[PDB]
Scaffold this motif. Structure first.
Motif, short mmCIF file in Angstrom:
data_model
loop_
_atom_site.label_atom_id
_atom_site.label_comp_id
_atom_site.label_asym_id
_atom_site.label_seq_id
_atom_site.Cartn_x
_atom_site.Cartn_y
_atom_site.Cartn_z
N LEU A 84 124.68 4.75 33.98
CA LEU A 84 124.28 4.98 35.46
C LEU A 84 125.49 4.40 36.87
O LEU A 84 125.40 4.46 37.44
CB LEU A 84 122.76 4.68 35.88
N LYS A 85 126.08 3.80 35.38
CA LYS A 85 126.86 2.79 36.69
C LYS A 85 126.84 2.80 38.07
O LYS A 85 126.86 2.05 38.97
CB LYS A 85 128.33 2.05 36.93
N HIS A 86 127.47 4.41 38.23
CA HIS A 86 128.03 5.03 39.36
C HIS A 86 127.08 6.29 39.95
O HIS A 86 128.05 7.01 40.34
CB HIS A 86 129.84 4.95 39.47
N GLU B 251 127.90 -7.20 39.88
CA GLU B 251 128.41 -5.74 40.79
C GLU B 251 127.80 -4.77 40.54
O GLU B 251 127.14 -4.29 41.16
CB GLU B 251 129.78 -5.49 40.19
N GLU B 252 126.28 -5.32 39.58
CA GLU B 252 125.37 -4.26 39.77
C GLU B 252 124.09 -5.09 40.36
O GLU B 252 123.25 -3.60 41.29
CB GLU B 252 125.08 -3.59 38.03
N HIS B 253 123.84 -5.87 40.02
CA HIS B 253 123.08 -6.59 40.40
C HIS B 253 122.93 -6.70 42.31
O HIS B 253 121.40 -6.50 42.69
CB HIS B 253 122.66 -8.35 40.31
N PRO C 2 135.20 -4.14 33.46
CA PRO C 2 135.12 -5.21 32.63
C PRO C 2 133.58 -6.04 32.85
O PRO C 2 133.30 -6.45 31.64
CB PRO C 2 135.87 -6.06 33.37
N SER C 3 132.98 -5.57 34.59
CA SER C 3 131.83 -5.62 33.94
C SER C 3 130.52 -5.81 32.68
O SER C 3 130.18 -6.50 31.79
CB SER C 3 130.48 -5.03 35.28
N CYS C 4 130.39 -4.05 32.33
CA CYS C 4 130.10 -3.42 31.30
C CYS C 4 130.03 -3.51 30.16
O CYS C 4 129.81 -3.09 28.92
CB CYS C 4 129.33 -2.05 31.63
N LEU C 5 131.65 -4.01 29.81
CA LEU C 5 132.26 -3.88 28.42
C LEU C 5 133.65 -5.15 28.59
O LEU C 5 133.99 -5.46 29.83
CB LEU C 5 133.36 -2.56 28.30
ZN LIG Z 1 127.83 -4.09 34.54
#
Ligand SMILES: [Zn+2]
Ligand SMILES: [Mg+2]
Ligand SMILES: [Mg+2]
Ligand SMILES: [Zn+2]
Lengths: 57, 156, 129, 177, 203, 37, 69, 30
Positions: C21-23, C54-56, H26-29
RNA sequence: UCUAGAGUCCAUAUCAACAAUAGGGUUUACUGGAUCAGGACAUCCCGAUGGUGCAGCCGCUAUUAAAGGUUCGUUUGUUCAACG
RNA sequence: AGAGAAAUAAGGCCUACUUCACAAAGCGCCUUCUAAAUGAUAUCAUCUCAACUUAAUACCCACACCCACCCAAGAACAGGGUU
């Protein structure tokens, strides 16, 4: 369209046992019915606007 | 891969997938035959064609006039045929070239009814403060082609 | 309740990535947001919900903009329709002087923390009208 | 279609009354659609000097929604003509004062800046709430689609589409939620 | 509640137990009849309204429509008709009369009338402009406006003070108190001065 | 409130906050050093 | 239901050299012919989207085949 | 900090540095 | 803007030196007054608020506020200044 | 929170004074309407560019006349009255 105004448009369509045979425009419903009669008469008499143009050759 | 439904996973347009060509070719042939059998039996009325001429694309039909701004070196009243038909249409069907229709499928006849010179046109140039003023009068010639017949043949 | 047993790609630190989902989520995706917030409109702590920074923060701004459009009626602490409001409605001064063309002051719309959502029109979407 | 002359001419250039809801729609989008329809720029037979403009009927004009903080920033300005009569009023204020004026000013801005403008504005009918007069309801023909899709809140998601969406994360159990 | 259409007679003094003086104006109520009624939403939201007439007039000097109205109403034509905004429960049937006793002393009352017409007036009689001095050479400028407007703007603002017609416009005095009522001649004794001239109808 | 271009807290019981769209520095004990951006 | 960029930018991809004067005349005076042309444009647009969405040079669309001089 | 001729502006804009996108965020890996 | 120097202790109650960042001019040597005034706020008063070393009216600074008001005289006229 | 008194500004009047005298005026008179509570991101806390809760009526208003006279209306035209 425009039922109440002074510039209405009524499209009146004659029918013959659930099948259309013409459709006419007008401002009054009477005039639209008259024009539907005229177009139906033209279609039955083979004198439409898009008839096979006379063949002069 | 899988992504849970949201407002942006899929785009906002529908997934339009086209019919399998194997059946589509049969369908196209069937409708082509239907139109052909319409043409053979005279199941059409007045016709109109998109004829390409001097440089312009005229939408024309039988008995109508056209005015070309260039003399066509034809005597008065000499029948001619207008090749380069881009589209010919009847009430129920219309045929589209890519970009022209074959010489056999469509036949457009025209006649030369009048050759004359257009009304006088003015060409005036002027510039301020430089005493630059000049005037010319031009009368481009022109000719009126009547279109006499759009005939079609069952060659599809 | 716990994780649904079908993760599109396990081995992911941010639950926003574990489902790809990240973007990919907007403010109006109320279903996604309505499980990161307390029963009183406030965001859950990061150290529990497990998102990355960055997602929070993106979820935080999304839930703010969701509240301000009235998309979470049953999450209150017990005249004007607006959507995509970045600033709180009661802390913005009117634009009495919208400058000339070359120094225009333009009204913010949406949040710039969602600058990287999957676009779908050639003209990129404006963050300032 | 073999209509006589006068009936054909009347049929082609006739005027059509288009309804257009406005609930939770932004003023600008309604303004764009209304501008196109009032001008006549939806008729293949259009021209500037033919007066092909139609009628538009925008209802629920009280319920429009402005993107962003525009309510507190978009300032409409007027001047009486007399000294000191320069009044600047935000969008919320002018909405309370006259619930039709925002959409009317949008449509006024978009339309062309010529003498015809006023005439076109005589064919824009704006009614603040769901109520419409009978003499105008009996004239409508179509119903143009809303240009913004009203996003729907949790109150109107059925349990089917709530449990269809996954549960993206796991809470602890000791936590008090 | 509805009001009256009086006629301004003149003025007099009247003293008070505390020892002060208080000029007053005399208002005679002549033939004040409620003439018409218009309903709450007939005016489209504001209030209900009454039309009250005053000061009976000749009948050979009126338009045909007004004579028809009064004939159907069974009264002789009045001079001035004025519209009062009242609540629904204050309604009065048209045809009823109104009398100076309508008021009572101890209240306050507002009076509206056409001021006295000074005609075309220059700027100092009309707006209190300090004109230009006398000798010391002020030739051909004594009672003249100075600069009408500033110089960068190439126009005079609307609403600039300039020569023109004065008075003869309706205006209202607020807060006038009522001291005395003469119920035999229908006089009201209203404090202070009231616009208009004598023998002119005030509301 | 002393208007300042950089808000520096002074003692250990004051706190930065964002109110009405601006950064303030409030304090309960020792109120002598409120600030405004 | 078809913008103007699509119509012209995807009639030429079907090698129809109808100009704009005659397109306007068809739109006013021959509605069903214009309906067909719009259908053709939407067809070619869909073919293009489907082709570009795919992987490689899978068989071209039934209308996307050029005719050489 | 004077202004530049417009064509020099376009040249500065077109030649602006574009960084290589990282393979993964980097955040998710790590 | 760094406080660094002071202030009976202490930069922030006050000046706040240099510098830096800002908005603005410096022409000579080898145009007021009356009349009517429109406007901005960088506010003199009136209005609202914060801190104070005002323990309190008033003072001091700071924020906000341009709806209203902003005197009469002696001497003199590069147009100011002094004085009641 | 009220009560008196004065001035000024706007608007109006002529009973008295005053200049004057069928009236116009002022020196005269009258009227003027950023501290909290709950609370998350960051479980305490926190006024919240977090959700959320608190701090003007009045005036005008009669489709259809106009020769003559009068007028507190007026430059002409308009306006009020002629029972
Ligand atoms: Zn993340
Ligand atoms: Mg003289
Ligand atoms: Mg005198
Ligand atoms: Zn502190």
């Amino acid at each position: 369209s425009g039922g109440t105004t002074a510039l209405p448009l009524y499209f009146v369509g004659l029918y013959c046992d659930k099948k259309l045979i013409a459709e006419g425009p007008g401002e009054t419903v009477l005039v639209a019915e008259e024009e539907a009669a005229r177009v139906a008469l033209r279609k039955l008499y083979g004198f439409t606007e898009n008839r096979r143009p006379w063949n002069y050759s | 891969g899988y992504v849970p439904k949201t407002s942006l996973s899929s785009p906002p347009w529908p997934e339009v997938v086209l019919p399998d060509p194997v059946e589509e070719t049969r369908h196209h042939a069937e409708v082509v035959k239907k139109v052909n059998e319409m043409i053979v039996t005279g199941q059409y009325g007045r016709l109109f064609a998109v004829v390409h001429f001097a440089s312009r694309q005229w939408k024309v039909t039988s008995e109508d006039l056209i005015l070309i701004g260039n003399e066509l070196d034809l005597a008065c009243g000499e029948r001619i045929r207008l090749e380069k038909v881009l589209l010919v249409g009847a009430d129920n069907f219309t045929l589209l070239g890519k970009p022209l229709l074959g010489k056999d499928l469509v036949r457009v006849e025209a006649t030369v009814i009048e050759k004359t010179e257009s009304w006088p046109r003015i060409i005036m140039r002027f510039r301020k403060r430089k005493n630059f003023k000049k005037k010319r009068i031009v009368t481009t010639p022109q000719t009126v082609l009547r279109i006499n017949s759009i005939e079609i043949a069952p060659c599809l | 309740p716990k994780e649904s047993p079908n993760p599109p790609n396990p081995s992911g630190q941010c639950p926003i990535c574990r489902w790809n989902l990240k973007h990919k989520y907007n403010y109006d995706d109320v279903l996604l947001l309505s499980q990161f917030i307390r029963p009183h409109g406030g965001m859950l702590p990061r150290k529990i919900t497990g998102l990355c920074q960055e997602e929070h923060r993106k979820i935080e701004e999304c839930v703010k903009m969701a509240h301000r459009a009235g998309l979470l009626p049953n999450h209150r602490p017990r005249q004007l329709n607006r959507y995509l409001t970045r600033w709180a409605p009661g802390s913005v001064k009117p634009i009495y002087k919208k400058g000339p063309r070359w120094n225009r002051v333009r009204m913010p719309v949406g949040s710039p923390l969602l600058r990287d959502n999957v676009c779908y029109s050639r003209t990129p979407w404006k963050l300032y009208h | 279609s073999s209509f006589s002359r006068a009936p054909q001419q009347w049929a082609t250039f006739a005027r059509i009354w288009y309804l257009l809801d406005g609930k939770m729609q932004p003023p600008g989008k309604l303004a764009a659609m209304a501008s196109i329809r009032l001008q006549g720029l939806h008729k293949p037979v259009y021209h500037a000097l033919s007066d092909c403009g139609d009628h538009v009927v925008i209802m629920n004009t009280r319920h429009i929604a402005f993107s962003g903080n525009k309510w507190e920033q978009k300032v409409y300005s007027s001047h009486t003509g007399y000294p000191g009569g320069f009044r600047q009023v935000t969008a919320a204020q002018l909405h309370l004062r006259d619930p039709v004026a925002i959409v009317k000013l949008a449509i006024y801005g978009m339309l062309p800046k010529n003498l015809h403008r006023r005439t076109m504005m005589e064919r824009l009918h704006l009614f603040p709430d769901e109520y419409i007069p009978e003499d105008i309801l009996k004239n409508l023909v179509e119903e143009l689609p809303q240009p913004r899709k009203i996003p729907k809140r949790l109150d109107e998601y059925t349990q089917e589409e709530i449990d269809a969406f996954p549960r993206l994360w796991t809470p602890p159990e000791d936590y008090r939620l | 509640r509805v009001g009256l259409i009086a006629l301004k007679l003149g003025m007099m003094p009247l003293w008070t137990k505390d020892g002060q003086k208080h000029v007053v104006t005399l208002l005679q109520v002549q033939d004040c009849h409620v003439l018409k009624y218009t309903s709450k939403e007939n005016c489209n939201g504001k209030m209900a309204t009454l039309s009250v007439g005053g000061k009976t007039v000749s009948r050979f000097r009126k338009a045909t429509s007004i004579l028809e109205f009064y004939r159907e109403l069974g009264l002789p034509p009045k001079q001035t008709v004025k519209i009062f905004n009242i609540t629904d429960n204050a309604a009065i049937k048209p045809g009823t009369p109104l009398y100076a006793a309508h008021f009572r002393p101890g209240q306050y009352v507002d009076v509206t009338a056409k001021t006295i017409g000074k005609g075309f007036q220059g700027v100092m009689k009309r707006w209190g402009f300090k004109g230009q001095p006398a000798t010391h050479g002020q030739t051909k400028t004594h009672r003249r406006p100075g600069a009408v407007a500033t110089g960068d703007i190439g126009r005079v603002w609307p609403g600039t003070k300039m020569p023109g017609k004065m008075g003869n416009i309706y205006r209202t005095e607020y807060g006038l108190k009522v001291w005395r009522i003469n119920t035999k001649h229908n006089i009201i004794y209203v404090n202070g001065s009231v616009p208009g001239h004598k023998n002119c109808l005030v509301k | 409130f002393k208007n300042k271009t950089v808000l520096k807290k002074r003692c250990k019981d004051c706190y930065l906050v964002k109110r009405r769209g601006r950064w303030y520095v409030y304090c309960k004990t020792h109120p002598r050093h409120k600030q405004r951006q | 239901g078809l913008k103007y960029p699509a119509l012209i930018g995807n009639l030429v991809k079907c090698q129809v050299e109808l100009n704009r004067k005659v397109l306007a005349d068809l739109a006013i005076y021959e509605p069903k012919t214009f309906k067909s042309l719009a259908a053709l444009a939407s067809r070619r647009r869909h073919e293009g989207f489907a082709a570009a969405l795919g992987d490689g040079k899978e068989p071209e669309g039934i209308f996307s085949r050029v005719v050489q001089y | 900090r004077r202004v530049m001729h417009f064509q020099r502006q376009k040249l500065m804009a077109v030649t602006e540095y574009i960084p290589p996108k990282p393979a993964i965020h980097p955040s998710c890996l790590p």
